[PDB]
Structure 1
Amino acid sequence: RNTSKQQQQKHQYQQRRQQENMQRQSRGEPPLPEEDLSKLFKPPQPPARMDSLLIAGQINTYCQNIKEFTAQNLGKLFMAQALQEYNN
């Protein structure tokens, strides 16, 4: 959740303000550059796709869901056995 929020604040939040500013500047200079237009947009460390953390995350959450499933399966049959022995 902190890893996703860090990439989102770089992907969306930086780019949104850069377009906000670039639209205020208006964005093409005809006799010579374009100095601050040339300065604008250079990649932050995540521009997209931190998959090495994400995929390894998902394999671990899948392992966690398997542990939830096995714990639930133990609980289903323990509840059944506890109810079954008492009532006769």
Structure 2
Amino acid sequence: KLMEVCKEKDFSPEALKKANITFEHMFEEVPIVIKNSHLINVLMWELEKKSAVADKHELLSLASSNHLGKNLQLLMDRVDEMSQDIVKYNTYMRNTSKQQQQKHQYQQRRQQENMQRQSRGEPPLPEEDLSKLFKPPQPPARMDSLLIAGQINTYCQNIKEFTAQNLGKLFMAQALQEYNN
């Protein structure tokens, strides 16, 4: 959709003018590693060697994850930085939502009352004031390129809250299933 409507996702113009057809923003986050590529048989030949008599390094990596939960704030520091990503990004996004309203309807409402109060011009002469007024605010159409990455980074928060989900859910799954002894 990015590729069709181009160039490219331009901010002040060509933002909502491509968000009219409405480009999709996150689409085909492609799969990664499924098949025995046969760059493997040699890796299997090291795997079998390190699963065999030389089982010091395979168990080193097995034992290494013991201290990634010992002292690390896997949840606390992450949900902190992601919550401060919320307070900064999402709330200035809401200030952008009020400011594009401070222009499209708020300012526009008394741009309309500027047009209408003079009987929409004079018969014999201009019509100077009507043509001079409606001075279009710097946002005339949504400012929808800040708001593009806007959606994509409020969804970065979505896949960051899906992170925070699988952190707490399967950790406390293992707690209430394992400990009861």
Q: Give the TM bin, normalised by the shorter chain.
A: 0.7 to 0.9
Structure 2 gap segments, 5+ residues each: 1-93
Q: Deviations over 1:28-80 (max 9, x none)?
A: 31111112112111222111131220101111111111011121112111111
Q: Is the 8 A contact 2:114 2:133 kept in 1?
A: no
2-side partners of 1:87 and 1:47: how far apart? 62
1-side partners of 2:136 and 2:108: how far apart? 10
Is residue 162 of structure 2 the alignment partner of residue 69 of structure 1?
yes
Give the structure 2 partner of residue 84 of structure 1.
Answer: 177
Percent of residue pairs bearing the same amino acid type: 100
* Structure with max Cα Rg: 2
User: What does 1:1-88 correspond to in 2, within 5 Å?
Assistant: 1-88=94-181
1-side partners of 2:180 and 2:128: how far apart? 84
Q: Which has the higher helix share?
A: 1
Structure 1 gap segments, 5+ residues each: none
Q: Is the 8 A contact 2:103 2:137 kept in 1?
A: yes
Q: Is the 8 A contact 2:120 2:130 kept in 1?
A: yes
For structure 1, which segment, 16-25 or 57-66, has the greater mean C-alpha deviation from structure 2 after superposition?
16-25
2-side partners of 1:26 and 1:42: how far apart? 19
Aligned residues: 88
Q: Give the TM-score of the pair, scaled to structure 2.
A: 0.45
2-side partners of 1:82 and 1:64: how far apart? 27
2-side partners of 1:57 and 1:35: how far apart? 40
1-side partners of 2:115 and 2:179: how far apart? 74
2-side partners of 1:51 and 1:12: how far apart? 17
Question: How large is the RMSD of aligned CA atoms in angstroms?
Answer: 1.4
2-side partners of 1:21 and 1:50: how far apart? 24
